[PDB]
Design a binder for this molecule. Sequence first.
Ligand SMILES: Nc1ncnc2c1ncn2[C@@H]1O[C@H](COP(=O)(O)OP(=O)(O)OP(=O)(O)O)[C@@H](O)[C@H]1O
Ligand SMILES: Nc1ncnc2c1ncn2[C@@H]1O[C@H](COP(=O)(O)OP(=O)(O)OP(=O)(O)O)[C@@H](O)[C@H]1O
Lengths: 204, 48, 96, 359, 116, 403
Amino acid sequence: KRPEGMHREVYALLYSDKKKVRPWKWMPFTNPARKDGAMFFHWRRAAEEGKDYPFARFNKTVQVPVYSEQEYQLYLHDDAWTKAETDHLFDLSRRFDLRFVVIHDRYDHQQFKKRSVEDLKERYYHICAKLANVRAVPGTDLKIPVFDAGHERRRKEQLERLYNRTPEQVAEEEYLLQELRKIEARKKEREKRSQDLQKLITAA
Amino acid sequence: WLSADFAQERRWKRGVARKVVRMVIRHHEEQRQKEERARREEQAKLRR
Amino acid sequence: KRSRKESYSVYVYKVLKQVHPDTGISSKAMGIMNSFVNDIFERIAGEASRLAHYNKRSTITSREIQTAVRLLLPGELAKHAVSEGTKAVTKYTSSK
Amino acid sequence: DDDIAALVVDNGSGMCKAGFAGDDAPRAVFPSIVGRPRHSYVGDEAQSKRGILTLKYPIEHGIVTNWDDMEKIWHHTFYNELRVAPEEHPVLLTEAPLNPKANREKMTQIMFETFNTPAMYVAIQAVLSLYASGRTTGIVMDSGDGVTHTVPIYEGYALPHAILRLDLAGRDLTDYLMKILTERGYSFTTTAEREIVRDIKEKLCYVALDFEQEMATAASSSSLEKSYELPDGQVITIGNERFRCPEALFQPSFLGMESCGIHETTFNSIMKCDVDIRKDLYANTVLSGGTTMYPGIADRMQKEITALAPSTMKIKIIAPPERKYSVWIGGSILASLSTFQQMWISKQEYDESGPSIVH
Amino acid sequence: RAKAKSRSSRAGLQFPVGRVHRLLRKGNYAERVGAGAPVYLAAVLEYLTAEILELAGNAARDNKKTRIIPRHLQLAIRNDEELNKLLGRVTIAQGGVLPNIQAVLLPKKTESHHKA
Amino acid sequence: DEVGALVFDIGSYTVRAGYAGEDCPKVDFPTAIGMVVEGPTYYIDTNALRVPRENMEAISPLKNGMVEDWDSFQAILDHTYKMHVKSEASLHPVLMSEAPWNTRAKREKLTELMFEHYNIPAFFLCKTAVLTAFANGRSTGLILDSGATHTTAIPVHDGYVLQQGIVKSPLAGDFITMQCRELFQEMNIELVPPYMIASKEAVREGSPANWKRKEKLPQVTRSWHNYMCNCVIQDFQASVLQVSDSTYDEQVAAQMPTVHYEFPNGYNCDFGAERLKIPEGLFDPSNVKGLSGNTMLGVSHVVTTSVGMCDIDIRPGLYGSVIVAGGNTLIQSFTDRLNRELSQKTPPSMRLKLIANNTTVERRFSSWIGGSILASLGTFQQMWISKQEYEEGGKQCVERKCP
Ligand SMILES: Nc1ncnc2c1ncn2[C@@H]1O[C@H](COP(=O)(O)OP(=O)(O)OP(=O)(O)O)[C@@H](O)[C@H]1O
Ligand SMILES: Nc1ncnc2c1ncn2[C@@H]1O[C@H](COP(=O)(O)OP(=O)(O)OP(=O)(O)O)[C@@H](O)[C@H]1O
């Protein structure tokens, strides 16, 4: 007699073709990423009461250099910049992860004269390059690729000119766009073809 | 990571709420359909 | 106003990546693979339809497809497909 | 199949609606109190010894603590539910109007730990009460003992931004009654007799329909002295309390603690909801809680919401005739449900995540 | 409602069981297709595709290439004993037949020193 | 990562308080709490404020999105802590939102006020724009918040606000309320709040309201009466007002279907082009009576100005992430008009993109949801202002841990 006893489809296919004891508890914990020893709380398991906080690894601070007063007075002296004017830049860099698009806004324009983004970045990179050049053993990337602030300035200016284009530099600019191809084709197809046809007529 | 999770979780929570509401509506409708089917079961018992 | 056309490029690239993580596939190779998929689809479907029709049956069932796979695939190739299909059906009816 | 095994609980501060789920009524209840020596009991024993024990309410207007008081409440509920866990026990517990994190996380953790339940769940009383009837949205009054919920539960979700509450549901109303008495006839002056006091409202709970009639109920001077009888047999001919403190619920100023009346409270609650959703809020107003039996509350709510609500929207009342335990009825309808099995929390997801689950 | 689960995920297949059953039900292959027919068909298609893709990737790695091309597919189909039997009638675009080695020319004849 | 905390979103219109990790705030009540000088008594519950009694002069503890009454601020905080929260502040860290233009003096006074009075374990003061960007799935982008007091476009770059790019306009909920007041006064509509109505009878459209005044009236102030009237006006706004798809055209405005609305006193009438001429002032304040002045910047103008004052290197990203939030943004067709105006103004190169969050919860509670997901991150645990940090570094610690 047919054994079956299982699902119809599977059966036909096969034959027709022969206590928990882990309590969660409210636990305090100290985050190694902090220096003040602030004690926080977390919903942890009982098997790991006391283990280090795992997210502490996500605390890699930016590499903003630190230098002494003597080093500054000796090498980083600048007629246009004073210590009160320079230390604030590095403070903002250390505080905002060394991004100059936010540091410029944070610049205290009350006590300090107005500075652009490009000149602030240039001063920072120049200070870094000087600190490196006055260092030999620590290998602080002696050959830093300091950007050209003037090229950066003119780039910021030309693209800003390309920004505001409402009246005719965005709509009528289609004319100059078509001209970009016309002049690259009409000028050639006229003058070079004139030369070619003159040579042909000479041969003819 | 957490914002995508929160958005998906809000959507899934609203979906589950819709599910449970439709399910209780189905429970009531099926209770009445079960009264009707008890009448039909009286008929089917006559038939048997 | 779009005229979208379908293809198996989505399940073949997935299969390729699950069996060959580092090796890709070109567009024309993908089209050839899709053509092979469609051809085997047609062959198996026609074989199952004809097999069901021989037994005066109006429904193509998993058993018909299983015997069609036994018939079409040659030598030591059918057995593997039949086993895969059976293990997928058993794992499908088990509600996993 | 948690359906056939379902368990439900609704403790609050009024009455512990607990026991095995599957039927359309609570298997057994107790007044949800615990007592200890003055210089341990729970349930009916605590209610019997209220005159000699140090009674405390493990539920305080929604706040709950489960280490001894609510743990003893649950240990007594063990008598209402089935016996030792492995028999039958999918457990959903009593959540407050809005205390989601603090209540849910700790309650779930400690209940799982104590009762070792392979199954459990948590949800707010509002949705489980709305499930008693089943419709798009509800503005359930849920006037129980310690809370008067205004929950606008649209599509089964308790919108917290629009959630409001009032505090004149239980012990406040009974105290206002006890102090209105002894100004008009007999009374008592201690919590040991507040039960026999509320036993006056458990039989005579006709409402005055103030602000539309406002004088005729008492001016009739006839067919209003039902003369509730005390254990001795006194016939003092219960008077204006026949019309006083049904309205204190709707007029908190009448008691002294002032706030939006229940009718206008719920009105504002739905006003805080979306403008496109509030349509079905008027036409699907539900009433829940023991304090809502009060046969006259239906017409009072109709009249007041009509006075406040626009004319274009009609006030459709669907208050169940047995709204006494509307919470328990819908909660069991939800729990006792075959297709609801896939939404319970078990050992697996507990161990993988813990009580820090979505809640 | 409950979170909808596809039929390809239940069985554990990558190819579309849904689209397979779709092509079948309105493909006139039968009157009322069974619930298991499409699952089995998709499983067999997936297995065959996985095998041919394995062979094509092996051929590509042997040829030191990353993108599979008709060359690799043809080589794989004609090298395997059973796939060639299954695809004997088939021809592939931009494909080729198995080649021969030219090393045989060297030790028979080459250019002599005459005016080299 | 997730610790029992309380995210406070103290908006000028409503304050939202709840636990970190939730999808919605635990409580949401109007910020214009009523006050009675009895110390002074404050009511922080909708059922305890909109009540026919208790003069409750509206003190509005904050104004212009900044704290202006520290005593009323303490009172509202206390009430929020023991009315719906019902928990000791010392057991829950506090993440509170702040207006970008909030001064440092305030920031520090608020910080110290939450350590010597409430003794909270940790503190953090994040800007509303940062939280909004955090919630909508963007670290860089422009935050357009059209609140009750002001409509502001706050450019956020890398999770930090660019102050120089902040643009504010007084065309906000207050302006809409004023315009609705003017419209009602022009149409001979008596704005009768609910608390003054005893009963009413249905009347025909446009006919005088047939309502009875309560005899035992409350002793309300002009402030509380105006507050009730403003609540009614805001209901009218949410029910009727609709932004014009294109620039307001009177001829096209007279071809739109009317919207029916019944005031609390029973007066009901259909509104035609008057409901679409009010919301036009937000985008085009030129055609506004009594607003004679062109310095006022519309929503699209505010956005374009805020993006123009920023470095061009980030303007593409700003246009690619323009998050719209606020209560006023819930007005019908507001998003479409804004997107159309921005597409017409935004240069072609700049890919304009408007995040598709438009739900009431998603819009009004964006600032709170941001902090809710920000305080639930394990990475945020290292940024808290701990009690020790405040005790050692003082009140000025707010400027370093949460600039
Ligand atoms: N037979 C009855 N008739 C009229 N009123 C009753 C009757 N029985 C109880 N009540 C009233 O109902 C109240 C009981 O409140 P209930 O048990 O519904 O509170 P709860 O909703 O469970 O608690 P919470 O408010 O915390 O949710 C009592 O205060 C009592 O006055
Ligand atoms: N449903 C609605 N439809 C249309 N407009 C509405 C609606 N609800 C509220 N508003 C308007 O939105 C305004 C409230 O703005 P909102 O509270 O969102 O700002 P906010 O988040 O408090 O701003 P801030 O955080 O800067 O204080 C009110 O003045 C009201 O006119």
